[PDB]
Amino acid sequence: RPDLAWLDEVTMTQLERNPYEVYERLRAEAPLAFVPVLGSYVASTAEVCREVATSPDFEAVITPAGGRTFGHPAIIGVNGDIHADLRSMVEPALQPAEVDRWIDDLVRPIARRYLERFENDGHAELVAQYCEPVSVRSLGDLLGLQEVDSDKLREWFAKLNRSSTNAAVDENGEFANPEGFAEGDQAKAEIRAVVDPLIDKWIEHPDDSAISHWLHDGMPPGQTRDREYIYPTIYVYLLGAMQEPGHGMASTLVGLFSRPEQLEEVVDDPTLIPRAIAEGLRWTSPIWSATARISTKPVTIAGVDLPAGTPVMLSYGSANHDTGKYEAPSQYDLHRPPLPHLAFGAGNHACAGIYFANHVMRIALEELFEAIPNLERDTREGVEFWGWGFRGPTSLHVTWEV
Numbered sequence: 001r002p003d004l005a006w007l008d009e010v011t012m013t014q015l016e017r018n019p020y021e022v023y024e025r026l027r028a029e030a031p032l033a034f035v036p037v038l039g040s041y042v043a044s045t046a047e048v049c050r051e052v053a054t055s056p057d058f059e060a061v062i063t064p065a066g067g068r069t070f071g072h073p074a075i076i077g078v079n080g081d082i083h084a085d086l087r088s089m090v091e092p093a094l095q096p097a098e099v100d101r102w103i104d105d106l107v108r109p110i111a112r113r114y115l116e117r118f119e120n121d122g123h124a125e126l127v128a129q130y131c132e133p134v135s136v137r138s139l140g141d142l143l144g145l146q147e148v149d150s151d152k153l154r155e156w157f158a159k160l161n162r163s164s165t166n167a168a169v170d171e172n173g174e175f176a177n178p179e180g181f182a183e184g185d186q187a188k189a190e191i192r193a194v195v196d197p198l199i200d201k202w203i204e205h206p207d208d209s210a211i212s213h214w215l216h217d218g219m220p221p222g223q224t225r226d227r228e229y230i231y232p233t234i235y236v237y238l239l240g241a242m243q244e245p246g247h248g249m250a251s252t253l254v255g256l257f258s259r260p261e262q263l264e265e266v267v268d269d270p271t272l273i274p275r276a277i278a279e280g281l282r283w284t285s286p287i288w289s290a291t292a293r294i295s296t297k298p299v300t301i302a303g304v305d306l307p308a309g310t311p312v313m314l315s316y317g318s319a320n321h322d323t324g325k326y327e328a329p330s331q332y333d334l335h336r337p338p339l340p341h342l343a344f345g346a347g348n349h350a351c352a353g354i355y356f357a358n359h360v361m362r363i364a365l366e367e368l369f370e371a372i373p374n375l376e377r378d379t380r381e382g383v384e385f386w387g388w389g390f391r392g393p394t395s396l397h398v399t400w401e402v
């Protein structure tokens with residue numbers, strides 16, 4: 001496409017460091033555009049992302065690096081009967097009435113435990129000391145991975161992140177950094193060594209762990225889902241489900257710190273925490289551009305005639321800065337009107353864990369502000385954000401008097 005020749009010079013490092021300048025141009029120039037270093041069409045605006053995610057002429061496809069990382073059948077990459085079965089598999093513990101039965105007793109003692117380790121120090125790096133541990137320990141316990149330490153869960157989602165977003169391709173469309181998948185393979189081998197004996201046990205002795213229910217629910221007597229059939233969805237969880245609520249709470253805190261009067265409002269009135277998080281997710285979307293759909297017939301989207309078989313990456317992080325919808329979207333603003341956003345995606349493959357994730361983030365921020373009402377950002381330290389596929393702050397140094 002001749003007028004987009006500047007896209008040939010966009011690098012993967014640029015998109016990882018900060019994709020918003022490139023995507024601001026894409027939203028204006030070409031809401032559906034082929035990005036050479038990604039080797040794919042990308043949808044950058046809210047209208048195009050929603051249309052593709054809900055269109056009957058598209059179905060899910062995994063990103064190239066995502067497929068190399070997760071294999072088949074990852075819940076994000078399949079359709080039809082297999083997708084219906086995997087949704088029925090994961091949905092029970094995520095049902096809102098079910099989450100409401102136990103979410104407080106799950107997350108609140110976890111939040112307290114991590115807080116107790118540092119709440120009197122006067123300094124902390126909240127990503128590693130709080131946001132990521134609460135996110136992974138909550139979900140890990142729900143899944144049946146109580147004995148997998150939070151350090152290890154955090155290391156796994158970071159390796160799976162890097163592997164599944166190792167998207168750069170060369171002049172020939174081949175992966176430019178094939179090495180980059182080796183740490184995803186290593187994380188999967190470690191996961192197998194830990195989880196295979198738990199599956200061995202759950203097959204014979206089912207319990208209330210989510211993974212035991214994935215093996216047993218809906219199955220004929222004495223049968224279980226084959227472990228090779230469920231492992232790719234286990235990996236999907238050990239990446240995003242483990243990583244995202246922590247990144248969402250952290251981005252929300254960075255946003256609030258950028259608006260000190262709003263931080264004070266939310267600390268004074270914790271009923272505003274859900275609104276603060278919704279704006280945080282729009283402002284820096286944790287799943288920024290990690291999923292995709294593929295056309296199943298020829299289709300015209302945003303003026304582009306696509307053949308059947310065309311993948312389109314859904315860059316929901318960019319769609320959530322669409323200036324067709326939002327005023328000054330790069331600014332965090334608690335008092336933005338509560339409008340629809342795309343940080344949980346859309347359509348048949350939209351996020352299955354929204355209600356759970358929102359409560360995990362809410363309870364974590366409730367307990368943080370409670371414990372440390374005079375929390376302030378350490379302004380001697382910069383907050384970098386990193387990531388094109390998944391995006392979040394790499395640290396969040398804070399301070400408080402005591």
Ligand code: HEM
Pocket residue numbers: 053060075076077087090094139237240241242244245248281285286287291292314316342343344345346347348349350351352353354356357358
């Ligand atoms: C703030 C935290 C989270 C955010 C921002 C988020 C966002 C998303 C997004 C954008 C997608 C892809 C949707 C699409 O392609 O249209 C997704 C898919 C998914 N998410 Fe969430 N997620 C979060 C937490 C979680 C958690 C904690 C769980 C599980 C407990 C979860 C389970 C899933 C599942 C199973 C899918 C795949 C749905 C499918 O393909 O049918 N998510 N999520």
Ligand SMILES: COc1ccccc1O
Pocket residue numbers: 076235236237238239240241287290291
């Ligand atoms: C819930 O985890 C994911 C969602 C979308 C893409 C990759 C994931 O691991």
